Amino acid sequence: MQCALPPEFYFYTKQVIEFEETDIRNLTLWERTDERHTGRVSNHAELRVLSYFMLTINWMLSFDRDRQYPLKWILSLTESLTQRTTTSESIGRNIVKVVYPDKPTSSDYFQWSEEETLEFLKWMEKQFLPTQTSMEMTIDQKIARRKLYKIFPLDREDTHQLTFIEDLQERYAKQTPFFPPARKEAIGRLLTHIASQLLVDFAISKEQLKDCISRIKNACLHR
DNA sequence: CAAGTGTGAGGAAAAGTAGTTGGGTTTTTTTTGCAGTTGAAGACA
């Protein structure tokens, strides 16, 4: 649902997980890494789930010999996605993007699709107040402050936006139209995007991620 | 190709403390009325 809600890909990936994903068994939380060096053994189950997820899309997409997923279909799932409002979710992911980390969302900072800009300032005027309350200062430093806020007073000197499954539905429809080198490029095009998404919620490692990716890649070819 | 010990540092933050100044008391060790009187210069036998 996160994006290319391609209903079939749920058990596609569930199946590869079925496959070599811990001998077709639900990944359990890793162990009590007692050692202080905290080696990257990648046993963090999810990290591998996302890895299988990505892989699945690439493989399945790479070899859909029957041509079940049309050339022009893959990029459509990309055009529809590349941003949009969010019945709360995407607005959230913007708020997380704003930890201004490795500059994958930094520019989103810059762009910030109009309103996204607006509902952002809304969430700042509501949840940033959870900000603070100078002490003593003869009331002085404080009063002055109060006056200043008295000054710019402001805060106002479809209910419009939509929910999550609404947005999800409408892009599933926006791809409503289902029934060589370029598609390979498009596929890589799309995978980078999800890499952005899944990586962005998490500790990324613009390569550990792929280090992780690399790992199971290796794991897999022991058929 | 690959997994596994040993381990040095980089980093964060509130309050304190620095430097540079000033403030700041502190703290501090032009006669206008009167009447008399003395001493004086001057003078004398």
Integer Cα distance of A160 and A87 in angstroms: 10
Chain B: nucleotides under 7 Å from a protein CB?
A: 2-7
Report the structure determination method: cryo-EM
Any idea what DSSP says for residue A137? T
Surface-to-core class of residue A45, CB atoms within 10 Å of its CB (0-12 exposed, 13-18 middle, 19+ buried): middle
Q: Is A96 left (phi over 0), alpha (psi -120 to 50) or beta?
A: alpha
Q: How far is CA A20 from CA A13, A15, A49, A65, A214, in A?
A: 11, 9, 12, 23, 15
Is A211:A195 a contact under the CB 8 Å cutoff? no
* Distance of C1' in B2 from CA in A205, Å: 21
Protein A163 CA to nucleic acid B30 C1', in Å? 100
Q: Is the CB of A35 under 7 A from strand B?
A: yes
The amino acid sitting at A127 is: Q
In this complex, the nucleotide whose C1' atom is nearest to the CA atom of residue A39 is: B4
Residue ranges of E strands in A32-189 = none
Q: What is the distance in angstroms measured between the alpha-carbon CA of A202 and the sugar C1' of B28?
A: 74
* CB of A160 within 7 Å of some strand B atom: no
**Statement: the CB of A37 is under 7 Å from strand B:** yes
Q: Which of A120, A131, A52, A133 is nearest to A90 (CA)?
A: A120
SS percent in chain A: helix, strand, coil, step 5: 60, 0, 40
Decide: A71 and A162 in contact? Cβ < 8 Å. Answer: no
CA dist., res. A14 & res. A16, Å (int): 6
